[PDB]
Amino acid sequence: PPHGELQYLGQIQHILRCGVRKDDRTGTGTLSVFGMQARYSLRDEFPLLTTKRVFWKGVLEELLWFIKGSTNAKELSSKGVGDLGPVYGFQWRHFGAEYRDMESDYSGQGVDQLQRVIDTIKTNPDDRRIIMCAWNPRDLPLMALPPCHALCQFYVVNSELSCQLYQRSGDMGLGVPFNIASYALLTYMIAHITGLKPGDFIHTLGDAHIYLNHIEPLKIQLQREPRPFPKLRILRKVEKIDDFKAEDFQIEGYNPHPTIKME
Amino acid sequence: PPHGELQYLGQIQHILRCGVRKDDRTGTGTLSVFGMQARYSLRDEFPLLTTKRVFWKGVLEELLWFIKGSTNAKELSSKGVGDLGPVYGFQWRHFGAEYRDMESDYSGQGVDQLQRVIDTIKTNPDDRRIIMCAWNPRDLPLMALPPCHALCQFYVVNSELSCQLYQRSGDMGLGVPFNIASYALLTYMIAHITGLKPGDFIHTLGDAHIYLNHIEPLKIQLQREPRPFPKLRILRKVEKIDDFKAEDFQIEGYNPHPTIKME
């Protein structure tokens, strides 16, 4: 079967050829297509794109930072990759709780969406509601009951854990490759602690767009041939999602094309 | 280009051939595939499936019922197609409001997601947050901040309004054809009141499944060749979403194959 990365490259090509001009929130232009989806297998391989070197270090370190529930930018930068407000970390572990400061103790406050997902998987794997949501902090004060930016739906069958990420919008050049790796990793972690094997990672987008200044660099990435995806190994038996450490993970066989800078 | 309905038929075929056995909430079995998407054009045509006669009357009447905000089953059945609790209608127009009884006056109570969508479209068409959500009433008392069942994201570009429906799960045999028509109609209505032309309707699914007792009837539907989609006409200029009446709509050129009963 065809290499998974061909879906991404195909989507980039489609946007360049059929995308419509549309400005973002800051009046910056993009080429846009509404409604996209791709499926990346997680069975014996990890979807870390190869037509450009993906910043794996930033992916892994940022995810661990989210899982910590931290809202302190210093804790992330300290890792080489500062109150940020109610960001993903806080929303994932203390959903619904009122935000104070990055030092406040939110134990038992709000809903722990993440642990709930893990709890639901081990208490009722057939459940159709294993869903986790995240908002753009910016939208919270904007209106009553603002819509989420993204949602993760997990699915279990035949001892395999799959995940579908639906994002309101997707920055195809910069954000997508990074997020494919990010959520594929989250699925690997959750599958590990729940004794399941990773299945598929489905990435679905609303406004899939390419920023004008990324067009030239993307046209070049498209000339590159994907190399077999690497493998992600967890060289340690972990029991709680909170116990994972960067050292517990090891990417193997990652042979990417040169780094590509996107403005 | 290929008839749009071929996506649905193709998805049915894929589930029958690759779907995995999985039980629903009641222990009833299904053939399931996680992660699906299809795109139906709404430009000069309406996606009312033809490989089986779809219950258009029920679609149109149910949608008008939702838009009314009604929670009285009698109001719908009276149309030939009774407190139901906080169902879609109530959630769409009084989102967040505490439910009492189908007679209570909820004016100004809760968030009117529907009108907000319409308001956002006419005040900022580029917005990436034109989202509306709905929950299964059943999940509300179940836990704090339960996940939604479905969400509608609208998108505007070049004077065309598109909509993407993401559903936690999809009953491929019974619910999907009906819902494709339902949300395609909603997009037509919203586009009409906002002076935009209908663009695309994107249907995305989490657990896309076929109930065991529908397999045989679906295998037969698959032997049928789709006929050109009909057209939906709005023979009246309407200004508010609440003013639409069943008579305002007229399906033309609908030449479907015989009705197919699904248990």
Curated annotation (Swiss-Prot), chains A, B:
Disorder: Dyskeratosis congenita, digenic: A form of dyskeratosis congenita, a rare multisystem disorder caused by defective telomere maintenance. It is characterized by progressive bone marrow failure, and the clinical triad of reticulated skin hyperpigmentation, nail dystrophy, and mucosal leukoplakia. Common but variable features include premature graying, aplastic anemia, low platelets, osteoporosis, pulmonary fibrosis, and liver fibrosis among others. Early mortality is often associated with bone marrow failure, infections, fatal pulmonary complications, or malignancy.
Protein localization: Nucleus; Cytoplasm; Mitochondrion; Mitochondrion matrix
Binding residue positions for (6R)-5,10-methylene-5,6,7,8-tetrahydrofolate: D171
One GO CC term on file: cytosol
Coiled coil: none
Quaternary assembly: Homodimer.
Binding site for dUMP: R25, R128, R129, C148, H149, R168, S169, G170, D171, N179, H209, I210, Y211
Pathway: Pyrimidine metabolism; dTTP biosynthesis
InterPro entries in the cross-refs: Thymidate_synth/dCMP_Mease, Thymidate_synth/dCMP_Mease_dom, Thymidate_synth/dCMP_Mease_sf, Thymidylate_synthase, Thymidylate_synthase_AS
Catalytic activity: dUMP + (6R)-5,10-methylene-5,6,7,8-tetrahydrofolate = 7,8-dihydrofolate + dTMP
Key words, A-Z: Cytoplasm, Disease variant, Dyskeratosis congenita, Isopeptide bond, Membrane, Methyltransferase, Mitochondrion, Mitochondrion inner membrane, Nucleotide biosynthesis, Nucleus, Phosphoprotein, Transferase, Ubl conjugation
Upper classification of the organism: Eukaryota, Metazoa, Chordata, Craniata, Vertebrata
UniProt record similarity statement: Belongs to the thymidylate synthase family.
Gene3D superfamilies: Thymidylate synthase/dCMP hydroxymethylase domain (3.30.572.10)
Residues at the active site: C148
Cross-link (Glycyl lysine isopeptide (Lys-Gly) (interchain with G-Cter in SUMO2)): K240, K245, K261
Gene Ontology BP, a term: dTMP biosynthetic process
HAMAP family, sorted: Thymidy_synth_bact
Alphabetized SUPFAM superfamilies for the sequence: Thymidylate synthase/dCMP hydroxymethylase
Protein name as annotated: Thymidylate synthase
Function: Catalyzes the reductive methylation of 2'-deoxyuridine 5'-monophosphate (dUMP) to thymidine 5'-monophosphate (dTMP), using the cosubstrate, 5,10- methylenetetrahydrofolate (CH2H4folate) as a 1-carbon donor and reductant and contributes to the de novo mitochondrial thymidylate biosynthesis pathway.
Alphabetical list of Pfam families matching this protein: Thymidylat_synt
GO molecular function: folic acid binding; mRNA regulatory element binding translation repressor activity; sequence-specific mRNA binding; thymidylate synthase activity
Enzyme nomenclature, EC number: 2.1.1.45
Gene, per the UniProt record: TYMS
